[PDB]
Amino acid sequence: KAFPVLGIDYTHVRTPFEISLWILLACLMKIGFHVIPTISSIVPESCLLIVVGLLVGGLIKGVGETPPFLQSDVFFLFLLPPIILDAGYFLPLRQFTENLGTILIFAVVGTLWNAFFLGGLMYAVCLVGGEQINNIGLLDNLLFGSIISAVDPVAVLAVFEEIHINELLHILVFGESLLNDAVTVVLYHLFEEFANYEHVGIVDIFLGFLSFFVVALGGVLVGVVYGVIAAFTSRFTSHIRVIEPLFVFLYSYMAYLSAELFHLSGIMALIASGVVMRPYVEANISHKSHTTIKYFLKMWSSVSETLIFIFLGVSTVAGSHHWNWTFVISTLLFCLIARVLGVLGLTWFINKFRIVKLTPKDQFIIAYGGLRGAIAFSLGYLLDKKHFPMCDLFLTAIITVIFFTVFVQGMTIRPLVDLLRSINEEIHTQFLDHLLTGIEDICGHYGHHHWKDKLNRFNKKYV
Amino acid sequence: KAFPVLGIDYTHVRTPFEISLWILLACLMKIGFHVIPTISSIVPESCLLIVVGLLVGGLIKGVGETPPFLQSDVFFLFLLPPIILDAGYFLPLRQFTENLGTILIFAVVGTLWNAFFLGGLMYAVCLVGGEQINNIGLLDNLLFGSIISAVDPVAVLAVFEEIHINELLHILVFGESLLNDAVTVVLYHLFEEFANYEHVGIVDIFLGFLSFFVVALGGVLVGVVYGVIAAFTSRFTSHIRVIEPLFVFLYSYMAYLSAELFHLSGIMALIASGVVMRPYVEANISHKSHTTIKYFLKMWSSVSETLIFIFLGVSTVAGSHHWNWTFVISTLLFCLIARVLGVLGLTWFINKFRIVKLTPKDQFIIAYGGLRGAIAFSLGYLLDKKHFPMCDLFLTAIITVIFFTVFVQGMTIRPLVDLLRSINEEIHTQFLDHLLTGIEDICGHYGHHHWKDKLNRFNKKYV
Amino acid sequence: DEELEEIKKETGFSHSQITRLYSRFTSLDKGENGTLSREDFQRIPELAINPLGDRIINAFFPEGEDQVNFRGFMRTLAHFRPIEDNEKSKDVNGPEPLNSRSNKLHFAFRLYDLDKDEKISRDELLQVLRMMVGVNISDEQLGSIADRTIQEADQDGDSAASFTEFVKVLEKVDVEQKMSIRFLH
Amino acid sequence: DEELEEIKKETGFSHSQITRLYSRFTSLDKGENGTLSREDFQRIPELAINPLGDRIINAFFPEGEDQVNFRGFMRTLAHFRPIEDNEKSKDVNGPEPLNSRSNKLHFAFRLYDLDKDEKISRDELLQVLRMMVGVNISDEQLGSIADRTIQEADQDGDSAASFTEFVKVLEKVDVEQKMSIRFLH
């Protein structure tokens, strides 16, 4: 072996080198996606991720490499918490807690409605469907409904602008996307366990109903504990500042792993930890370190979403498919109907319980514009084959729903929704505002203003 | 199983959770290391890393967990390139290329001298040592000498200040640490392959001599190729700016993996890629993104060094030890003597070939102050047991050398070296400067000024 | 059940809203004899912090009397009851409801006006602005803001154009959303 | 071998340094007859860019003659030869070497001085400063800098204190390192 060291050993660097190649290709298409004059405001970013995944999967198929896969430990530990923490860190806590009621209604109740409505209707279709969609059952199909209701409406916000997206709809879709990705994972684990009980009684249904809230709220509690710890330890990192971002990421990640340790909701723990630490940081942290934290979250979430959509591409062009016309067409149509019915019903229920109503503009955007991706696919991809023997059909339905809801429901929402400050004003605005508040404080109904003032008193006390 | 989802599954989150715990402990000690009034300027940062590793290893030993280990793929692919890229990115290219001759002399030639002098003297000791250090041989012992000469003098710069560290000594130790970590890894792979030839002839010695330069310069060539590519693609990332740091990290990492693919010097490729891209970025990249890149490199290198020193702690308090008094004492004494002799001889050789001589101050700092760590340990820890049956003795010697060179040679260098601008001046300075230059341009000797002016003409031409 | 219907006709609330308000009333009574007075309002923890706080305490009161009965509290508080479209839309004869688009901005003018002389003036605007803003900001700054608002608002020419123009410059500002309170049952 | 020893005594170089310099000399001769002239120096690519470039071309020249021979180039260039301690230290009688701490700063003064009248003056400083700095910067700025340097430098009282004080304010500035060139063999 002349020239001893020299070699061409490529097995040593395949996973890191090819993952770097994928992230490089996705980044190069992003810098080839914002240079086209007006295309970032016509087509969502998720479409670019889909197309990048399709090209990478096509390259993998053409070369002949065995396509890589999510290990169901890399997703739930290394690829999910980036996305969740990026989403739930820059949550506008003011707007989020002002109308927290409607956000919780949409996210939790609308996600449960989507999940159970899709489960029931897909079960009804399977019962009366061909011999290759029978024997799916209820729990195996209700789990599919819960997976496919993991929806990301906030991507549609990229297609709009400051106009048509008020501070109400923006926070509504933002919180809906967050807590929907939380509730769908909670339901995913719940149904994935219920699908091996072989006897689901009423007592088991009640226990699952309790465990839903126990998982979610235990995640919230772990998150606030780690957020308080991060808020405290951020006061002392003024001496060494390149460690300031690291403490935020470490404490959020440890909150996620402490929630997932006890099988609580890691996503809700991540969200709660970020939301708790954010106000008490950015005041104890320098501007440079806060700007970094922002950049870190953005690009690390972008890398994670890129990787998820690359896996989607490689499993849609180079994977196993079990296309069923009845199941796939029914799931497309029923996802649209379940989403629309949930949005309409819940908006009707909550307009009468609030001051600022939800216009048909934002009702249409929420109902038509909730687009799947990067969590629906990954949740439906990590389904076992031993359990859920039909999981290839579920993957085909989920991929078709993602493509239809991103390319047809996201590329045809802006050209489908536009067709369906004097000095006085300022003075008076502040005036009416101080007026209403005083009045609300006189009547006394314990709305949200009272709670926020109590929160502020608590904050002062701590400080 | 009441409350279905709830569980206490900890095997799922052990590696991520415990690595997060370790990084959190190291960060908490860093924010407990800069709050003590005057201790960051008395004891180096490497001592804090050693102590953090010792505490984490002690906790692992006390609990009873099986101690984790470097997989020799995680180090050379995920833990080394952070450190190398952080070091070689903020390389002050001006000062580095001004006196490039002396930096290359120290790094390459002094590292080779340290490696071969330690190999020869340790071989001489083993030949006349006890029956448990015989049969080590030359190549197995010359490899140990090359591993233990992976030295990091720049850590000592933390103990000094702007005074006592001029722009010459600072760049000298910086480039020495970089290219020493490069040359020691090149020699490590070279000797680790030569240790299975069972017949090393003169033709094999010459082939290894050629392959040293082939590996190093092929790494440099791959690095400049990827640096040119990154410089080009940085012109177009103005539209999307959260991807600007990602392109730097991706292109440097791909340079590293392309060099390691062909078994070339990945470290030199990383250094060359960073050095090439840096001038042509930070001009095409916004200030926020450059500040991020800086923060990313600093904290990601800090995490990698933390992890390496944690592994050092767990393998020194909870590992296998083969302490030999002759070998360990001889290697301590001979590391000190080899370092001192190399520094003295090379400084004497290069003072006569330059204008600004090296004072006994900086000669003492380079000779006494080159402290091992985080690459010496890791290189000497990934040695096989099949090959190199004595590798436990090598690990014990390397750990002892790290502890002695960090705690005795780094804590007793500041209290061992302090005891052994009118308007005119400014005008005249610039004047004499413009004067000398003109003169050097008249005489014509092709020094470095000429080369730099040619480089500038080339840069203009490109732009 | 007490007498509630006549206020349920005068104000226009429902029964549960009135019951909850009367509950808060009894809680804030801190004594039956001071059914409701100025000090009774002043010792509410938070409104006194509000810059307009004192004006709000005297804005309910019809005349110089220092006592408010429950029914008068209802009459003054109804001004905020949200405008209900079909129910403002069902029968049209006279503006019996006090929560109208007119009465809602009239409460604003009565809160601005020093006395019930319908005179918003540079003194009035300057006083309320100095209340809403802190004491630190320059009087010349407040002078500029207040007199600029007077100038643009005044189409009367006497710098007043007080109510009729108040409505016109606030018409651009939806008050149906801005100034109304939903009182939970 | 040509005549080299007498320059090796006059200048104090070694033999290889002189050989390499003569090689560069022949390369820059671009013709034997113009052994070395003003234009011959001007067409060197880079020094003409240097602000002091023209002064350096006329600084070698002893007198108004427009030709430089090789030996004169050696005499003028030796001024930069690095001071060698033991070899400046071995025999002490008279300052035969021109590379001394005195002659090195005398070349500087001869480059500043307009003529060889030893007169650094506000005109001299202002001219050289306007050369080193660009043309954009204010003449009042240059006036401030130049006259402040004159004031601090001048202990003569005539604003000159030209050479004797030049040495004193530059003594704080090591010229042994700053102004000398090692000529590779």
Residue numbers in the entry:
A (entry chain B), B (entry chain A): 87 to 506, 516 to 558
C (entry chain D), D (entry chain C): 11 to 195
From the paper:
Sodium/proton exchanger 1 (NHE1) is an electroneutral secondary active transporter present on the plasma membrane of most mammalian cells and plays critical roles in regulating intracellular pH and volume homeostasis. Calcineurin B-homologous protein 1 (CHP1) is an obligate binding partner that promotes NHE1 biosynthetic maturation, cell surface expression and pH-sensitivity. We find that NHE1 assembles as a symmetrical homodimer, with each subunit undergoing an elevator-like conformational change during cation exchange. Each monomer is made up of a dimerization domain (TMs 1−3 and 7−10) and a core domain (TMs 4−6 and 11−13).
To investigate how the NHE1-CHP1 complex is activated by protonation, we prepared a sample at pH 6.5 as well as in the presence of 150-mM NaCl. Subsequent 3D reconstruction focusing on this class without an imposed symmetry yielded a 4.0-Å EM map. Two helices were observed in the cytoplasmic region of the NHE1 protomer, termed HC1 and HC2. Whereas HC1 shows extensive interactions with CHP1, HC2 is amphipathic and presumably binds to the membrane surface. In the NHE1-CHP1Na/6.5 complex, HC1 and HC2 helices are perpendicular to each other. Moreover, the two CHP1 molecules reside at opposite ends of the rectangular-shaped NHE1 dimer, by interacting with IL6, HC1, and HC2, resulting in an ~30o angle between the CHP1 molecule and the membrane plane. We hypothesize that absence of the HC3 helices in the NHE1-CHP1Na/6.5 complex model is caused by the splay-opened CHP1, thus releasing the HC3 helices from the TMD dimer. A large funnel between the dimerization domain and the core domain in each protomer is accessible only from the intracellular side, indicating that in both pH conditions the NHE1-CHP1 complex adopts an inward-facing conformation. In the context of inward-facing NHE1-CHP1Na/7.5 and NHE1-CHP1Na/6.5 complexes, the CHP1 molecule exhibits high mobility relative to the NHE1 dimer, resulting in featureless CHP1 density in the EM maps.
